[PDB]
Amino acid sequence: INYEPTVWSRADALKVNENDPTTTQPLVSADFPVMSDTVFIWDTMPLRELDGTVVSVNGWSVILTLTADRHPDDPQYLDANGRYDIKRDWEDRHGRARMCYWYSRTGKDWIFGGRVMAEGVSPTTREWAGTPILLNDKGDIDLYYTCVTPGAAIAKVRGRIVTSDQGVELKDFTQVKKLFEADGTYYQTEAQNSSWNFRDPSPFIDPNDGKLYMVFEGNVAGERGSHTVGAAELGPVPPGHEDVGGARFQVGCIGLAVAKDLSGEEWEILPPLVTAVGVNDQTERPHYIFQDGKYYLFTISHKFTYAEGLEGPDGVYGFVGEHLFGPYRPMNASGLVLGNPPEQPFQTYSHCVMPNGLVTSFIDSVPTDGEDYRIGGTEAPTVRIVLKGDRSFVQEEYDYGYIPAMKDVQLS
Amino acid sequence: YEPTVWSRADALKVNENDPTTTQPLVSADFPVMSDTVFIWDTMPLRELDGTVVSVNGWSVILTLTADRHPDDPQYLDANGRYDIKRDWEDRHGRARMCYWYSRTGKDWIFGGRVMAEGVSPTTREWAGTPILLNDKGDIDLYYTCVTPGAAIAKVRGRIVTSDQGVELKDFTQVKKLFEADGTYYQTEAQNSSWNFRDPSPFIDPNDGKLYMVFEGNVAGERGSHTVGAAELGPVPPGHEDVGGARFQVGCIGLAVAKDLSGEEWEILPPLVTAVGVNDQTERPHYIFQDGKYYLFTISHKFTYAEGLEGPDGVYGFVGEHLFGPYRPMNASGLVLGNPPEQPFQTYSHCVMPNGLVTSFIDSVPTDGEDYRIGGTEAPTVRIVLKGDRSFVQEEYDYGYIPAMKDVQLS
């Protein structure tokens, strides 16, 4: 299987408008509530089927979160005056990340369910994001996730959900199987770049050929600093935008893999679907909506992972087309689907666009009086978007962490 | 077929600050082509497939033209001050078609009036398209006769050339082809500011029939139109109020000819409508490229409805079928906008199939809070089209309109 990737060019990124009211996330309130005073949560992963549908089980909604403890009373984060450095505690989350689950009858007011896997089950101490798939009405679940440090592998672990009128348990996630890692020909490896990105599996059944595929975040293969920013990467920039500076250091891509069969036990990597060399280093958490005969491929990125000479917000970006292997076109012409507002540029991250149009994200940093800011580590308000052809439009907002079921599955 | 709606929600995506869709700045010291006439809307000689053509090596353009009056007491105050801005605003009622020619596609030589005074049924001769019909030099000039009423019309004539230049001759009998009907397009009785003008004929690349697009307004008594869900589109919270938007009712119209002679026309329903968005979708014209129909139209900042903001310049809609549906170029519709620091520098853009875009100079700011009037050609600029998007490229000299193909007369 061979196909050329869709290039997200610099010329495309010069169309990004951070001030478009149709593509701006609503402002998060400075007095947002926090789901936990003992843990931070961030990347949130709704339970779903391989076709994309977000599901409850026996009337319980279930989400997985990356989770790290809070350390307010810990001397290493306390200065001479006993002030707590929450910002540093929050920045330290990534090395402590573990998968936990939460549940609710209502799609909000989440009840903590605890760790998915016992400590030591994961091959790496870090357990980074992926997708929990409900496989059947017996309650079997495949959790696809990323094992990081040493190395980075996309992995899966099988377990089960059981419920009662009192709540949910996830059990028996006891054997992790690594599936694949970066190869060095299509996707950049650790030996080529110790800051390589390789993570966030999103598995699905393709609506057209019915095979099991996954997309994931990668980087375009090649030694750090070797990539070329040539015509394709620059695109048809206007006069005075020819200089790229050190843009060749930014090399994000959305990757694709295909399973040998529908069990998803053996995978083969395919070439990059969408590349952003010279544009942005991080095309994170890629995921699809299948709607109106089109593939809508969304990906999250940061203002500060852009190449020199470009400006855009943290938030959701997207590419659309009629065929799984492309070519794709940038949503809203620039690629930007939902950007943080410029007055609160880091208020939310790790958005997940669900097929009902609702978009969930977590709160990162919200400005407060005195040119300060508060840390979130909790769910943001959900907001709905509508897709129309190659364009999107932001609509109304919902409560914090609202993630309703699209379908309820009753267990056998 | 149902029209494509350009909605308010689409228009809220218009970005006046995008470097890929901004016209280059016009220099304060631009040259003027004539110190005796203003020119504005410029119409290159072309074939019915869109190709811009020279004839025996001569490029030819038509312009709307009006005299300048710098020594006329009606524009002069007691102190000798010349009200050029008023003279320029008064051009519309003095408009006549003239032609110009050049071996080089610039440094245009004045050819004079196309039609003798009195040939046109109306004194005003407003814009359209000159079509070179064959290698004998026959030409159909499609144009608009305005006041009283507004009719799309045509007049047949011919071009002859020599080593010394070009003549356009024998344009002596105008035939009116059609006017607004009142069910598809708005009429004078429904709105005395009705828009109905600017014919752009072409042979469709798919069915081989002769059609034309033109500027209209959606039919209905002034003030009666509804700005409902389709016109509003999926606006975000806080953008529900439309104020007086139902008074802005621009559309791009379509008509079809009985046969390839283009002597008898039937109107068809509007292709693209902008009720509640903008009153003026002017000079519609196509490029046929990459299996698509790119339909461009020019509009003004000051013809937008309340609650919307966009620049003077070129807008566009793209699709795969003549009858639609079409999608707005660059998501918002904007293709090339004037820069916000010189918002009225150019107008009446004509995108040619080689990507070059010609426009005229209107007003350019100068030293102080002052400005200069144009009435002369602006620098040509090239755009490139990529799917449903466009990107501005390099600029060329003032009024550069090179031929795509030369036709030797037999």
PDB file of N, CA and C in Angstrom, chain B residues 46-51 200-206 209 211-213 254 285-296 318-322 326 351-354 385 404:
ATOM      1  N   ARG B  46     -12.614  38.585 -25.152  1.00  0.00           N
ATOM      2  CA  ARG B  46     -12.416  37.166 -24.908  1.00  0.00           C
ATOM      3  C   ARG B  46     -13.306  36.330 -25.819  1.00  0.00           C
ATOM      4  N   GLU B  47     -13.037  35.011 -25.836  1.00  0.00           N
ATOM      5  CA  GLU B  47     -13.916  34.087 -26.511  1.00  0.00           C
ATOM      6  C   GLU B  47     -14.955  33.571 -25.510  1.00  0.00           C
ATOM      7  N   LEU B  48     -15.939  32.810 -26.020  1.00  0.00           N
ATOM      8  CA  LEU B  48     -17.023  32.288 -25.193  1.00  0.00           C
ATOM      9  C   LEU B  48     -16.543  31.175 -24.266  1.00  0.00           C
ATOM     10  N   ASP B  49     -15.309  30.688 -24.454  1.00  0.00           N
ATOM     11  CA  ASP B  49     -14.776  29.736 -23.490  1.00  0.00           C
ATOM     12  C   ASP B  49     -13.998  30.437 -22.376  1.00  0.00           C
ATOM     13  N   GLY B  50     -13.885  31.774 -22.434  1.00  0.00           N
ATOM     14  CA  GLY B  50     -13.217  32.511 -21.377  1.00  0.00           C
ATOM     15  C   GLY B  50     -11.825  33.029 -21.747  1.00  0.00           C
ATOM     16  N   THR B  51     -11.214  32.481 -22.810  1.00  0.00           N
ATOM     17  CA  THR B  51      -9.849  32.848 -23.168  1.00  0.00           C
ATOM     18  C   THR B  51      -9.781  34.323 -23.558  1.00  0.00           C
ATOM     19  N   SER B 200     -22.174  38.162 -18.367  1.00  0.00           N
ATOM     20  CA  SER B 200     -20.933  37.425 -18.636  1.00  0.00           C
ATOM     21  C   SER B 200     -21.273  36.118 -19.355  1.00  0.00           C
ATOM     22  N   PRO B 201     -21.244  36.070 -20.707  1.00  0.00           N
ATOM     23  CA  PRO B 201     -21.691  34.873 -21.440  1.00  0.00           C
ATOM     24  C   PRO B 201     -20.553  33.857 -21.572  1.00  0.00           C
ATOM     25  N   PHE B 202     -20.929  32.567 -21.716  1.00  0.00           N
ATOM     26  CA  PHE B 202     -19.911  31.532 -21.878  1.00  0.00           C
ATOM     27  C   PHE B 202     -20.607  30.286 -22.432  1.00  0.00           C
ATOM     28  N   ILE B 203     -19.816  29.435 -23.100  1.00  0.00           N
ATOM     29  CA  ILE B 203     -20.342  28.117 -23.483  1.00  0.00           C
ATOM     30  C   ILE B 203     -19.960  27.156 -22.351  1.00  0.00           C
ATOM     31  N   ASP B 204     -20.949  26.444 -21.809  1.00  0.00           N
ATOM     32  CA  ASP B 204     -20.708  25.556 -20.678  1.00  0.00           C
ATOM     33  C   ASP B 204     -19.800  24.399 -21.102  1.00  0.00           C
ATOM     34  N   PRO B 205     -18.706  24.104 -20.374  1.00  0.00           N
ATOM     35  CA  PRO B 205     -17.799  23.026 -20.783  1.00  0.00           C
ATOM     36  C   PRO B 205     -18.413  21.628 -20.712  1.00  0.00           C
ATOM     37  N   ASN B 206     -19.526  21.482 -20.007  1.00  0.00           N
ATOM     38  CA  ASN B 206     -20.137  20.177 -19.870  1.00  0.00           C
ATOM     39  C   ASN B 206     -21.215  19.951 -20.937  1.00  0.00           C
ATOM     40  N   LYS B 209     -23.911  24.310 -24.195  1.00  0.00           N
ATOM     41  CA  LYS B 209     -24.893  25.353 -24.469  1.00  0.00           C
ATOM     42  C   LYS B 209     -24.329  26.721 -24.058  1.00  0.00           C
ATOM     43  N   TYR B 211     -24.733  30.112 -22.032  1.00  0.00           N
ATOM     44  CA  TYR B 211     -25.377  30.659 -20.854  1.00  0.00           C
ATOM     45  C   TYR B 211     -24.753  32.019 -20.572  1.00  0.00           C
ATOM     46  N   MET B 212     -25.298  32.732 -19.578  1.00  0.00           N
ATOM     47  CA  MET B 212     -24.584  33.903 -19.083  1.00  0.00           C
ATOM     48  C   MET B 212     -24.889  33.995 -17.595  1.00  0.00           C
ATOM     49  N   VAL B 213     -23.919  34.498 -16.823  1.00  0.00           N
ATOM     50  CA  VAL B 213     -24.293  34.934 -15.473  1.00  0.00           C
ATOM     51  C   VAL B 213     -24.323  36.465 -15.411  1.00  0.00           C
ATOM     52  N   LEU B 254     -28.573  33.580 -13.616  1.00  0.00           N
ATOM     53  CA  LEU B 254     -28.157  32.746 -14.746  1.00  0.00           C
ATOM     54  C   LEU B 254     -29.250  32.791 -15.820  1.00  0.00           C
ATOM     55  N   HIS B 285     -18.365  36.181 -12.852  1.00  0.00           N
ATOM     56  CA  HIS B 285     -17.654  35.585 -13.979  1.00  0.00           C
ATOM     57  C   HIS B 285     -16.966  34.295 -13.544  1.00  0.00           C
ATOM     58  N   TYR B 286     -16.805  33.366 -14.508  1.00  0.00           N
ATOM     59  CA  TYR B 286     -16.216  32.061 -14.210  1.00  0.00           C
ATOM     60  C   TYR B 286     -14.761  31.911 -14.632  1.00  0.00           C
ATOM     61  N   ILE B 287     -14.062  31.030 -13.902  1.00  0.00           N
ATOM     62  CA  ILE B 287     -12.928  30.295 -14.456  1.00  0.00           C
ATOM     63  C   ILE B 287     -13.303  28.817 -14.453  1.00  0.00           C
ATOM     64  N   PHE B 288     -13.039  28.090 -15.550  1.00  0.00           N
ATOM     65  CA  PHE B 288     -13.236  26.639 -15.543  1.00  0.00           C
ATOM     66  C   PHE B 288     -11.865  25.955 -15.441  1.00  0.00           C
ATOM     67  N   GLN B 289     -11.559  25.291 -14.313  1.00  0.00           N
ATOM     68  CA  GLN B 289     -10.203  24.788 -14.065  1.00  0.00           C
ATOM     69  C   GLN B 289     -10.300  23.524 -13.191  1.00  0.00           C
ATOM     70  N   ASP B 290      -9.503  22.465 -13.486  1.00  0.00           N
ATOM     71  CA  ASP B 290      -9.372  21.321 -12.579  1.00  0.00           C
ATOM     72  C   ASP B 290     -10.723  20.645 -12.348  1.00  0.00           C
ATOM     73  N   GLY B 291     -11.577  20.615 -13.376  1.00  0.00           N
ATOM     74  CA  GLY B 291     -12.866  19.943 -13.286  1.00  0.00           C
ATOM     75  C   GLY B 291     -13.905  20.728 -12.476  1.00  0.00           C
ATOM     76  N   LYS B 292     -13.604  22.003 -12.170  1.00  0.00           N
ATOM     77  CA  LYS B 292     -14.496  22.779 -11.309  1.00  0.00           C
ATOM     78  C   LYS B 292     -14.979  24.061 -11.989  1.00  0.00           C
ATOM     79  N   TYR B 293     -16.078  24.611 -11.449  1.00  0.00           N
ATOM     80  CA  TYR B 293     -16.602  25.934 -11.790  1.00  0.00           C
ATOM     81  C   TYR B 293     -16.241  26.901 -10.662  1.00  0.00           C
ATOM     82  N   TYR B 294     -15.395  27.880 -10.948  1.00  0.00           N
ATOM     83  CA  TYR B 294     -15.060  28.907  -9.979  1.00  0.00           C
ATOM     84  C   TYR B 294     -15.824  30.157 -10.396  1.00  0.00           C
ATOM     85  N   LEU B 295     -16.768  30.572  -9.551  1.00  0.00           N
ATOM     86  CA  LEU B 295     -17.649  31.681  -9.886  1.00  0.00           C
ATOM     87  C   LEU B 295     -17.267  32.844  -8.954  1.00  0.00           C
ATOM     88  N   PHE B 296     -16.707  33.894  -9.539  1.00  0.00           N
ATOM     89  CA  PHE B 296     -16.193  35.026  -8.788  1.00  0.00           C
ATOM     90  C   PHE B 296     -17.243  36.138  -8.880  1.00  0.00           C
ATOM     91  N   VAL B 318     -17.356  27.855  -5.457  1.00  0.00           N
ATOM     92  CA  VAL B 318     -16.783  26.814  -6.308  1.00  0.00           C
ATOM     93  C   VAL B 318     -17.679  25.576  -6.272  1.00  0.00           C
ATOM     94  N   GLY B 319     -17.799  24.910  -7.422  1.00  0.00           N
ATOM     95  CA  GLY B 319     -18.401  23.598  -7.366  1.00  0.00           C
ATOM     96  C   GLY B 319     -18.097  22.774  -8.613  1.00  0.00           C
ATOM     97  N   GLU B 320     -18.687  21.569  -8.685  1.00  0.00           N
ATOM     98  CA  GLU B 320     -18.451  20.711  -9.830  1.00  0.00           C
ATOM     99  C   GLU B 320     -19.547  20.784 -10.884  1.00  0.00           C
ATOM    100  N   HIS B 321     -20.697  21.416 -10.612  1.00  0.00           N
ATOM    101  CA  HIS B 321     -21.812  21.425 -11.560  1.00  0.00           C
ATOM    102  C   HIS B 321     -22.303  22.868 -11.754  1.00  0.00           C
ATOM    103  N   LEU B 322     -22.625  23.228 -12.998  1.00  0.00           N
ATOM    104  CA  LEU B 322     -23.063  24.582 -13.300  1.00  0.00           C
ATOM    105  C   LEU B 322     -24.225  24.990 -12.391  1.00  0.00           C
ATOM    106  N   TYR B 326     -22.780  25.163  -4.792  1.00  0.00           N
ATOM    107  CA  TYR B 326     -21.443  25.749  -4.742  1.00  0.00           C
ATOM    108  C   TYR B 326     -21.058  25.929  -3.278  1.00  0.00           C
ATOM    109  N   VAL B 351     -11.008  38.368 -12.713  1.00  0.00           N
ATOM    110  CA  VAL B 351     -10.072  37.259 -12.623  1.00  0.00           C
ATOM    111  C   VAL B 351     -10.047  36.558 -13.982  1.00  0.00           C
ATOM    112  N   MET B 352      -8.880  36.539 -14.651  1.00  0.00           N
ATOM    113  CA  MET B 352      -8.804  35.860 -15.928  1.00  0.00           C
ATOM    114  C   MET B 352      -8.239  34.447 -15.755  1.00  0.00           C
ATOM    115  N   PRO B 353      -8.464  33.553 -16.738  1.00  0.00           N
ATOM    116  CA  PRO B 353      -8.121  32.150 -16.537  1.00  0.00           C
ATOM    117  C   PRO B 353      -6.641  31.808 -16.384  1.00  0.00           C
ATOM    118  N   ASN B 354      -5.753  32.747 -16.727  1.00  0.00           N
ATOM    119  CA  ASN B 354      -4.321  32.675 -16.457  1.00  0.00           C
ATOM    120  C   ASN B 354      -4.025  33.090 -15.012  1.00  0.00           C
ATOM    121  N   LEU B 385      -5.326  29.016  -7.710  1.00  0.00           N
ATOM    122  CA  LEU B 385      -6.447  28.320  -7.111  1.00  0.00           C
ATOM    123  C   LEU B 385      -6.006  26.901  -6.763  1.00  0.00           C
ATOM    124  N   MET B 404      -3.858  35.530 -23.782  1.00  0.00           N
ATOM    125  CA  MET B 404      -3.651  34.110 -23.569  1.00  0.00           C
ATOM    126  C   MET B 404      -3.468  33.394 -24.904  1.00  0.00           C
TER     127      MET B 404
END
